């Protein structure tokens, strides 16, 4: 619920949504506090666009989430949450 | 000098004997020790002793036998803030600091090159 919220005049790209929506169902968002989930979305997407640029290209061109992307994505989402400064106490 | 074959072991381990009938009845009670000499063999008391001061004192003795080792000793005993020479690593704090302070220093190297290449001429 906190993830689906969106501000006004702020559309999101389809590929970016897949990443955020993915982290939610997998349960990784359960670690950080709810009030920090909305800002985590912005920071996570920005972190991906800079460092993980090839990942976004495959999801865009092929339009499918391959297993290689799942392992990479499944590994960075728990990692990033520990990297950024968030309230890890659920 | 001669070393033989690395693969082969000493001939003692390879040389064997076999028994036959009749057999001597006598059972050896003790090992013969006619001459009391056990030189060049280290004591077996030095078996399960934990780390202590003798480890860093003997380390310096062997390090001082090398050129690179003499530098380590002099630098460690003078330029390391430690309350003891028994160094025990249980965290990588001191190790990460030295890496971020070094790998980061080499940042801006590419942006510096871009300045020269881009300041060379104006596309227009």
């Amino acid at each position: 619920v906190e993830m689906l919220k969106q501000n006004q005049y702020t559309p999101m790209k389809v590929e970016e949504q897949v990443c955020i929506i993915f982290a939610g169902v997998k349960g990784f968002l359960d670690a950080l506090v709810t009030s920090e989930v909305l800002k985590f979305e912005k920071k996570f997407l920005e972190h991906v666009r800079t460092n993980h640029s090839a990942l976004l290209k495959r999801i865009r061109d092929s339009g499918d989430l391959s297993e290689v992307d799942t392992n990479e994505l499944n590994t960075i989402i728990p990692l990033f949450i520990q990297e950024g400064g968030f309230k890890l106490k659920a | 000098l001669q070393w033989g074959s690395l693969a082969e072991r000493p001939m003692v381990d390879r040389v064997m004997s076999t028994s036959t009938w009749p057999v001597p009845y006598y059972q050896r009670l003790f090992k013969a020790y006619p001459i009391r000499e056990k030189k060049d063999k280290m004591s077996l008391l030095l078996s399960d002793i934990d780390i202590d001061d003798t480890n860093w004192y003997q380390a310096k003795d062997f390090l001082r036998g090398s050129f690179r080792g003499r530098q380590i000793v002099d630098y460690v005993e003078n330029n390391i803030a430690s309350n003891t020479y028994i160094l025990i690593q249980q965290d990588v704090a001191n190790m990460a600091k030295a890496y971020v302070h070094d790998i980061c220093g080499y940042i801006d190297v590419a942006n510096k090159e871009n300045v020269r290449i881009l300041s060379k001429g104006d596309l227009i």
């Binding site: - | 009845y25 050896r28 009670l29 006619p34 009391r36």
Partner: protein, 54 residues
């Protein structure tokens, strides 16, 4: 650089006690008495035979 290393001259000898020897040890223990004892009774008398003497 390592091959160019050298070795310092060590001391010639340490102190030699004028009243301790290997045969006449100054201090006492049961270890030296054991050596003198087994020299008296001699080493194990190993028999090469297939049956006992008795």
């Amino acid at each position: 650089k390592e091959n160019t290393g050298s070795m310092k001259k060590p001391m010639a000898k340490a102190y030699e006690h004028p009243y301790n020897s290997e045969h006449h040890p100054l201090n006492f223990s049961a270890v030296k008495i054991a050596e003198t004892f087994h020299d008296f009774i001699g080493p194990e008398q190993v028999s090469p035979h297939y049956e006992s003497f008795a």
